[PDB]
Structures are given as structure tokens and as C-alpha cells.
Amino acid sequence: WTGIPVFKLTEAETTRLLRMEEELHKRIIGQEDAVKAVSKAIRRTRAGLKDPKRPSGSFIFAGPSGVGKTELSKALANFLFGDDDALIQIDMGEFHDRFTASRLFGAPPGYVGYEEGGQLTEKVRRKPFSVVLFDEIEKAHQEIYNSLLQVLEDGRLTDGQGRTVDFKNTVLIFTSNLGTDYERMKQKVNDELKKHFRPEFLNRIDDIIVFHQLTREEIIRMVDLMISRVAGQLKSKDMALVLTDAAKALLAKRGFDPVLGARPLRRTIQREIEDQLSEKILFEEVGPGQVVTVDVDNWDGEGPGEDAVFTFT
């Protein structure tokens, strides 16, 4: 009827639930605390022991930019529903104005736009078991926080139409950028949140998670896990990509920067490999039924490699 997975725990889904930390780790590298907390939340939800009034899960994500705060939520949505589109993505960046709070729950009666009701309220009513993402929560005003102040404790919200929607089976995730060796920046993030967010609001969130900074082993795994996307895109045109170990080492070497996130790795691969592949494809260097072997020339594998180049077969 309503899609809420209050079922008998079969063996397959049980074995999936015990091992879902690895399943989230298939896409999310690092951030073991956040993945563990999400696993505990979903285990508490599916075991039937939960506070009826409170939602299934409420968390706030903070840390550097591009550390998978949104990606963990997207992977969780893919885990629960089978696709990334099912995630309710409400972006708080266009809610800088105070008067824009009506976009969430709807228009009051007597005004224009009363008939279609709210936006997130309707989407919650359609899919009661869904994860709702609020990106850039620091960037909207604190006035809009008050509508969610009810659902982070009671899980009920009243639209402009007047009907009450429920948030008891929804997972709420908030992502911010406050603060931006681990515990000092964790305390800095805590102080930033305490000064910027009212303490009465912060107590209604089940857990606060500080995202850890990306390290070298994380980015060397990241190169493979993200070039898998390029390989899969190439497979749509009967193209095969393989990277040498030196290719991975050079890609991680030129994209390592602790002050930014993983988007530098995207920049590195985009400016080094993908553009060259596009040039060779449109110049017909490689054709259908052919594989591509990318190797690093003029490098030892240990130096910084300011002169290393990529060879294509």
C-alpha cells in the first residue's frame, strides 16, 4: 500500500543489512563514522525498535567541501531504492530570502498558489519512506528552520492546505560547510555550529557527524572508483579503458590537495585523460572494437612528475 518496508526480515536482506557498511563503502571511501552511524540508524529503523514520534534518522553533515557529504546520502538512497533519483533533494541555497519559506509547505489560503499545496510535503506524501536532503543548510536564513523545528522532534508538519504530513518514516540529512589534527577541527566545527545554530534546534538532531579529511589511500582508491564512470561511459560506444599503476599514481599525485576535496581529482582526470581521449576519438585514432591502454611515460613513479605524459594505444 504505502511502501513502508515493515516486513519480515528475510535472509537475503538481513545479510545485506549486516554487510551494508561494505555496500556503502563500495561507493563511499573513508568517512567510517558517518557510514557506521547511518548503518546503526537504518538497523534501528528496520528492527522495529524506534521512537514512534521521532523520525527514522536525523543527522547534520559538516566538514570540507567535496568530502562525500552529499554522496553518502545519494548512495544511501541508491541502497534503499535502487536509484539516485528517488532521493528528495531540497536545495536550501535558493532560500536566502525570508519570504521563500512558503516554497516548502505551500501557500496560505486566500493567496495565489494555494491549490497546488507544498513541494516537499507532496513528495513526502507520495513516498513516505524516503530520504530528504537539505543541502547548504547554513546558507538559508534561520527563519526557515522553524518549520522543520517541529518535524525534527514530532515528525509532523502542516501544509498551507491544512492537512498534516508525517515524517516518521523519513530520513533527514543536512549538509553544511562550517569550520572550513582531526579533533581540533572537530571542535572548531562544533563551536561554529553552536554559534551559528540555536541550541534549541540542535538538540532535535539524532547525531552530529564531522566529516574526516580525505587522505592519500582514499584518493588512490578514488581514482579507480571514479574512472569506473568514464570506463562505463566508454562501454556505451564499444570502447575499453584500462589504466596502468603508474597512471593511477600520477593521477593521484597531481590531484592531492588537503585544502580542497575530490573535485580536484575530477579536474585532474578531466584535463589529462578525458580531453585526450575525446581528441583521439574525433581524430579517429581509436575505433570500434578497440581497447585503450593508458600508460605514463617519462616518470619513475616516485618523483612529483612535472614532465610525465600519458601514452594511448
Partner 1 sequence: SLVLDQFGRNLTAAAMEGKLDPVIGREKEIERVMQVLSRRTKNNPVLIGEPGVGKTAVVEGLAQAIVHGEVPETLKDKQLYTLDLGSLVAGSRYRGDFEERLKKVLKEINTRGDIILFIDELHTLVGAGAAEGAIDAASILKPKLARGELQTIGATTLDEYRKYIEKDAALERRFQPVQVGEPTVEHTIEILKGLRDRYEAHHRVSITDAAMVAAATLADRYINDRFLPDKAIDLIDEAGARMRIRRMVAEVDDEQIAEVLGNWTGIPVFKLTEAETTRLLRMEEELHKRIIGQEDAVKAVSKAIRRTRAGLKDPKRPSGSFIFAGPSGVGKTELSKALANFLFGDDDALIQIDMGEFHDRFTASRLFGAPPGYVGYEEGGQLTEKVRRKPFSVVLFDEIEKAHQEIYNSLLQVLEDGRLTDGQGRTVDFKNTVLIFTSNLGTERMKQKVNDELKKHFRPEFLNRIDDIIVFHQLTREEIIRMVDLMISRVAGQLKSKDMALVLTDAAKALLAKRGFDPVLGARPLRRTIQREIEDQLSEKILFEEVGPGQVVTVDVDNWDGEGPGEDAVFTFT
Q: Which residues are annotated as a binding site for ATP?
A: 63-70
Check binding of 270 to partner 1 (CB under 8 A). Answer: yes
Stretch 133-152 residues interacting with partner 1 (CB under 8 A) = 135-136, 139
Give the C-alpha separation, 259 to 248, whole Å.
21
Check binding of 238 to partner 1 (CB under 8 A). Answer: no
Is 35 or 273 the residue whose CB approaches partner 1 more closely?
A: 273
**Nearest position to ligand ADP, beta carbon:** 68
Is 3 or 303 the residue whose CB approaches partner 1 more closely?
A: 3
Binding-site residues, please? 63-70
**Contact mark string toward partner 1, 50..79, x via CB under 8 A:** ---------------xx-------------
**Contact mark string toward ligand ADP, 252..271, x via CB under 6 A:** ---------xx---------
- As measured in angstroms, the least distance from the Cβ of 280 to ligand ADP is 25
**How many chain residues touch partner 1 (CB under 8 A)?**
58
Check binding of 22 to partner 1 (CB under 8 A). Answer: no
Contact window for partner 1 (CB under 8 A) among 35-43, 148-156, 183-191, 225-233: 225-233
Stretch 177-206 residues interacting with partner 1 (CB under 8 A) = 177, 180
**Contact mark string toward partner 1, 88..107, x via CB under 8 A:** -xxx-xx-xx-xxxxx--xx
Q: Which does 106 bind (CB under 5 to 8 A by kind): partner 1, ligand ADP, none?
A: partner 1
Is 41 or 132 the residue whose CB approaches partner 1 more closely?
A: 132
